[PDB]
């Protein structure tokens, strides 16, 4: 398979304007017809070079003439000779039965549907299957009409008929020239739920969102969120949808989350499907995060699209950054923060430290689809985040506004992105560039001093990023970091210097720089890197009371939070050594009482409390080490659970009956009082036995809805109380039927603390509700177990690994993608101690010498080996 590099972009030789299509639909065999209006750009002897896989082709014509100055070749059709402007037929078949990759045109349950992103569309016909072409579309669909009732594509309807022999046809057409990644289709036989929203200056657009029958009972949160995000993108952003209908339709067989294709989202139905019964508070945050998400991309991503893949964070960060900001300005921002930087800190540090770091701006992909990652997309929306924080909320929508001023219609570049906000606001941004294009995180370490003879508070700053494997130089960034001084009563001190305030957003460009801050009437606690203001690591030499003293007064709930996040962080580290020498936690009497003191603060928001008792995830825990012992982690996870349930025994059971709620509402108050609830319900579990397991079992039994239920059920495994096997057998007997809800419990089996949780993962294969045909499936069973059971994915007798590479062997043939995430515990073996790197060096030996090695696995396993 081989690289390639965005230095090697250039324009294309042939443009496409217009496209129309015809599909004879059929399960077994579609026959595509394409009838493309071209316009050559470059030589006059360049052929037109169209991209395919996987297509028969049956016909080439040029301007109605059988062509014959054409080849085929592995991936492309390569046609000589061609006038400068041409009408271009090709006809081809192809087989969405066959496509168990979900790449392309396929089935999902009994329904037709495509994933065109980033290069799917090959896989229905031939064609320039690169961002930079945009084309108008038209789109004519064939089918039964028993079978395929409903006939979905992009735009609007403009033609309709019925044929012979029960067949039927719709045309549709989209105004807008897109890229062929954001094509879609969809046949088949749905309920519809039917809304409108009208924009704020009078379009009424009509909103439908199609699902399999019988769901409609699960439809109307995700109409809710529609809306909800249609109305905040007009307040916050000044956009309008653009067309006159807006359909999502919810899938069961997908790979990628959901896609945004212009007027006819195709979701994930684990992003669609909610009700009170089926789905948590965090399903319905989620399905609020990506019904926006999407919608955002209407124009971040669609009305200005990307000129090649290297620029996906263009859309990706800025999307991304687009749904926080929703979420935030919706529900809780100090809890969107906070989560959004424990996926930072523990999950997307993991990633820059792994053989697959890259740039935001990635300088060299095999497959495209292995770079839609934690990088791209949250540490891209981080990046954006600074420009953020930079410019201020009104230079950043002058910002916004002039990017779409200048390349509304067009394919941009990451680079534009940045030249429009540095054009808008006049701060310079040539600097600050370099966050997309050097990957790895860096690590900034504060001293500081105060000089009591001239009341000046100095910080000396210092930043590096250490090398990572596909870059081995490092340059300083333009890191924005945000402070804030605080005396000895809590209040914030003014910063100034000469007698001149200074902004609380200090500019650390350098390798290593001072700060000097004039009238500094008393020793400041310092908050350093305020609201997670850079996605970096830092380094400041705290005192546990300088942390205390922070959960008590800082002013953000971000730096409360975060201050209790660097007290355990130190007894963490303490504890995970401890338990390598075979001895017991320790835990001062003092850091104790800092939790105590927030359960029982009566003036702390619910929210942040709930945050702060929910320890960091055994992902976080594993990146405050080089070398990650993951059974040490687990189990100082669970005796750091048990030592504060066992010291706050008492305060634990007033909050969590102080927060039952007898009305169930998706609604942020009542979330914050039930997260609190079930974060103490988490430590009760892990206290007296016999106690722990009552209030479990009749949490369970008495939940009026499946946050609470799956709460109890989840503290059952963990805490591995007497009741769990009962309501696990429950639950299956109750809900085996409904996908969605089973991956809660396959999530449960896979991340059990059961000695025997790889032999029971193994037969669960075997479950009425488990199968390799279906992504989600696979990731709530498989992936759960490899990603978020580390202590049982690298037991050190190796079966971990050998389980893993059993399933990869599958799915290496079957889906790729799904198979590259689920590779992705593998690849970090460097973390390891040199026993495992061996067992897991083997693995990836053993995966590399597959036939038919898929290039996604391919690109991730040398990166590896290497
Ligand atoms: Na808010
Ligand atoms: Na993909
Ligand atoms: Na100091
Ligand atoms: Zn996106």
């Known amino acids: ?15 496409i304007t217009d496209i129309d299509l015809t599909f004879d639909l059929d399960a077994q065999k579609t026959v595509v017809t394409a009838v493309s209006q071209a316009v050559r ?117 403009v033609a309709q008929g019925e044929l012979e022999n029960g067949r039927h046809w719709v045309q549709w057409q989209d105004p807008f020239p897109k890229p062929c990644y954001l094509f879609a289709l969809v046949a088949g036989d749905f309920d519809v739920l039917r809304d409108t929203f009208t924009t704020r200056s009078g379009r009424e657009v009509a909103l439908e969102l199609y699902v399999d029958r019988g769901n409609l009972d699960r439809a109307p949160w995700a109409m809710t969120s529609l809306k909800n995000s249609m109305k905040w993108d007009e307040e916050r952003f000044g956009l309008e949808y653009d067309l006159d209908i807006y359909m999502i339709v919810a899938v069961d067989f997908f790979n990628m989350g959901a896609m945004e294709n212009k007027g006819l989202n195709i979701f994930n139905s684990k992003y669609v499907l ?86 935001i701006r990635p300088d060299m992909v095999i497959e495209m689809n292995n770079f839609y990652t934690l990088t791209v997309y949250e540490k891209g929306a981080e990046v954006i985040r600074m420009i953020h924080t930079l410019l201020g909320e009104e230079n950043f929508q002058k910002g916004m506004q002039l990017y779409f001023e200048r390349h509304d219609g067009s394919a941009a570049t990451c680079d534009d992105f940045v ?23 860096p690590i900034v370490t504060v001293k500081d ?36 001084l605080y005396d000895n009563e809590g209040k914030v001190i003014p910063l100034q210097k000469g007698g001149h305030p200074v902004n609380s957003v200090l500019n650390v460009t350098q390798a290593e720089q001072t700060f000097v801050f004039d009238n500094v009437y008393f020793q400041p606690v310092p908050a350093l890197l305020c609201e997670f203001s850079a996605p970096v690591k830092l380094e400041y030499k705290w005192s546990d009371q300088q942390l205390t003293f922070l959960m008590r007064h800082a002013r953000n709930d971000f730096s409360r939070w975060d201050a209790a996040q660097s007290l355990l962080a130190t007894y963490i580290k303490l504890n995970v050594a401890r338990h390598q020498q075979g001895q017991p936690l320790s835990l001062p009497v003092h850091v104790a009482d800092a939790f105590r003191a927030v359960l029982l603060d009566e003036k702390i928001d619910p929210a942040l409390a709930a945050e702060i008792l929910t320890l960091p995830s055994v992902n976080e825990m594993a990146e405050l080490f080089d070398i990650i012992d993951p059974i040490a982690i687990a189990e100082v996870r669970e005796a750091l659970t048990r030592t504060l349930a066992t010291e ?54 008495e939940a009026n809805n ?112 799904v198979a590259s995430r689920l590779i992705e ?42």
């Not at 000046?456 to 990572?468: D, E, K, N």
């Not at 946050?707 to 805490?719: C, I």
């Not at 970090?828 to 010498?849: I, P, T």
Request: charged share 25%.
């Open 825 to 866: 515990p593998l690849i970090r073996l460097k973390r390891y101690d040199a026993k495992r790197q061996e067992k897991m060096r083997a693995a990836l030996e053993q995966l590399k010498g597959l036939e038919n090695l898929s290039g996604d696995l391919y690109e991730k396993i040398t990166k590896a080996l290497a």
């Open 449 to 484: 001093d105060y000089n009591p003879e001239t009341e000046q508070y100095t910080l000396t700053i210092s930043q590096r990023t250490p090398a990572t494997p596909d870059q081995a130089e490092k340059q300083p960034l333009h890191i924005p970091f945000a402070i804030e």
């Open 648 to 701: 706050l025994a008492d305060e634990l059971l007033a909050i969590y009956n102080a927060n039952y709620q007898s009305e169930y509402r998706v609604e942020h108050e009542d979330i914050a009082k039930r997260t609190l609830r079930n974060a103490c319900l988490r430590f009760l579990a892990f206290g007296e036995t016999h106690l722990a397991d009552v209030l479990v079992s009749k949490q369970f039994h």
């Open 706 to 817: 499946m946050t609470d239920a799956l709460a109890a059920l989840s503290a059952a495994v963990a805490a591995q109380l007497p009741c769990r096997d009962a309501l696990m057998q429950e639950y299956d007997d109750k809900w085996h039927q409904n996908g969605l809800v089973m991956d809660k419990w396959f999530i449960l089996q896979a991340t059990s603390p059961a000695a025997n949780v790889l032999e029971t993962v193994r037969g669960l294969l075997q479950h009425r509700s488990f199968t390799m045909s279906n992504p989600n499936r696979i990731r709530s069973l498989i992936g759960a177990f490899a990603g978020s059971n580390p202590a049982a994915f690298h037991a050190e007798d190796g079966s971990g690994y050998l389980f893993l590479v059993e399933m990869l062997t599958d799915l290496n043939s079957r889906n790729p993608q």
């Open 1 to 15: 398979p081989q690289a390639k590099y965005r230095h090697d972009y250039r324009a294309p030789d042939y443009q």
């Open 41 to 157: 750009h470059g030589a006059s002897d360049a052929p037109l070079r169209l991209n395919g896989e996987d297509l028969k082709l049956v016909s080439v014509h040029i301007n109605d003439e059988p062509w014959t100055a054409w080849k085929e070749e592995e991936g492309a059709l390569v046609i000589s000779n061609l006038p400068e402007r041409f009408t271009l037929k090709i006809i081809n078949e192809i087989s969405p039965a066959a496509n168990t990759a979900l790449e392309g045109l396929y089935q999902s349950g009994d329904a037709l549907c495509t994933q065109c992103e980033a290069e799917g569309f090959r896989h229905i016909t031939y064609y320039l299957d690169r961002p930079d072409v945009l084309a108008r579309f038209t789109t004519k669909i064939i089918a039964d009409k028993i079978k395929y009732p409903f006939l979905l594509s992009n735009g609007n309807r």
């Open 274 to 359: 909610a009700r009170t019964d089926t789905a948590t508070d965090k399903d319905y945050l989620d399905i609020e995060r990506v019904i926006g998400h999407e919608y955002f991309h209407n124009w971040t991503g669609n009305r200005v699209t990307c000129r090649d893949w290297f620029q996906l964070s263009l859309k990706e960060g800025l999307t991304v950054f687009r749904d926080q900001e929703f979420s935030s300005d919706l529900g809780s921002r100090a809890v969107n923060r906070i989560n959004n930087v424990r996926t930072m800190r523990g999950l997307q540090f993991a990633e820059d430290a792994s053989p697959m770091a890259h740039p």
């Open 419 to 441: 030249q429009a906000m540095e054009d808008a606001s006049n701060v310079d941004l040539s600097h600050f560039r370099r966050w997309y294009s050097q990957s790895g995180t």
